[PDB]
Amino acid sequence: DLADRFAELERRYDARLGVYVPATGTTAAIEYRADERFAFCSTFKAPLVAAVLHQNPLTHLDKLITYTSDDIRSISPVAQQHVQTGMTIGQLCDAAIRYSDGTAANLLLADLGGPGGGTAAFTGYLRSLGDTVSRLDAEEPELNRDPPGDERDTTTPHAIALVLQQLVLGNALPPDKRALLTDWMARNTTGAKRIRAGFPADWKVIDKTGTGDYGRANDIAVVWSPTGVPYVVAVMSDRAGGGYDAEPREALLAEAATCVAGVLALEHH
Template identity: 25%
Template sequence: MKFEFTGKPLLAALTSAAVLAGCASSAIVPQPRAPHAPPPQQQQQPVRSSTGSVTVPIGQPVRSELPAPRGTLDPGFRRPPAGLSDRINGLWRAFPGKTGIAIQRIDGEWEFSERGGDLFPQQSVSKLWVTMAVLDAVDQGRLRLDQMVRIGPDDLAVFHQPLAARVLAEGSVTMSVRDLIETAITHSDNLANDSLLRTVGGPDAVRRFIANKGLGSIRFGPGERLLQSGTAGLTWQQSYSRGRNFQAARAALPDATRKAAMDNYLANPVDGASPSAIASALTRLARGTLLSPESTEYLLGVMSRTKSGPRRLKGGLPPGWQFLHKTGTGQDYKGMTAGYNDIGIATAPDGTRYAIVVMLGNTTSPIPARMSLMQAVSGAVAEFHGR
């Protein structure tokens, strides 16, 4: 394992905190240092690594954009609390399957990870990038939150899409971009997300947003229908969007076809992202450097209302902590799940914020064990906070 000092600007954190006051975020206010005392110097320290642990820093070493903070800071500002990285390493080593973990102090200067640079299937975590691309278009005046979008039977997606029942019952549904964002993020509705994706300009528009913002190792796939059919070994047909037609077609495939498709997906996920890149993106979102102040506040508010995964990372935080997040869960094949994730921003009672990312690339562990791992990770962050 390895950790680095990110050198992110404290002023950006303070500015973001002021903007996001409604989202229970805050930063640390430094005390003045005597004029003769030089500012503390950046340094890097190695942390014990284990065989097989691959950790990649967030891009290249980051140059400080502002002078280093001066005065008395809490001990956890520049480096992880003693023992936290070892605790996370132990949890990571003990859990079967390909696991990635990244933790970053948003109002600080450190990040560490396990397999932080590897690509993991995102699944519904990628809905976050769709919404960000939409809000960026709103910031640029190309879309409006009150813009109406029509959704018809030919737009239906696959798997979790509660909105589909309304479309089928009413023939079509018209919803605002704002309502589609709420539905896509808080309920992880695939139809709402694909409708936003179509409205913003398709997968290429989201990829341009990721590239233009320099988010690093984050891929965006072809959309829910093509992603899921490709993972299963199917060629998409719109009839798969009705009832359980997709599951029936998938079950009729030869086992060799399903296995080859799943193996190919896991080896090179078209929607893959690295835990460190996601943690960095969450930090930048919280600091207000990805979207306008209004869009930042709005998105963090939406993420605070996420309904899915209450027993994943959120379940490990003690009373008084707040958590804004997005989950993602992939298809199962013979007891193995291709992607079981939770990513989010945890805020301590004193306002200190942490980006926490846990991604299970492939695991056969039962769901309670997966949730227990995630709770242990977030619980460790809370336990060691302030040490």
């Protein structure tokens, strides 16, 4: 069975794997360690952008945020490029999702909750969606670095998939805001070797990845069948076995996603 297959992925990559695919009308939930905690890493950036979208008119996307080289304390490919001229809130959302820019995320946290109030306000957004489990406690890059077992800055596959479901396939956001979030995730540049690699080309995939220390590699996606049937897929992993500098394994994620896609695509008439 599928649990046994997921277990064999864990043995082969010397990793811990978490999977959740919510139940639908026609399919049972897929759950593997689904209530175990894993570090968010950059996956929180998706609901962060929704938080900012939700709380503000679309005109707030035009607001120019200025920052300095001193505020760049994490890998920030887009923020580095715009450091002299600043970035709009809209540009920051784009950067945060599509490049996993760490400075962009920190600046959106300040915008949501003020300095020192951002991680609490982000977690409160999750609470506002009925997620009592997830918590963010630090900003970038510290949130990627807590040890195995620390509950800070964690979610569960179950919790983050149900949030993403609300955001993309529910009514947590009005249509016009919902469309921006979905466009950004659709245009993501960092996920080609993860959930995307597991689904056939005629399935549509949107995603947000995360990567961190202790071999952490995550991806959260929404996928659409060739006839437009939607599913939410969360895959989380770590490799605590090799300590802080353990190599993350994207191919573990691609494999877990391929197992999911088999169950989702394979009909039985």
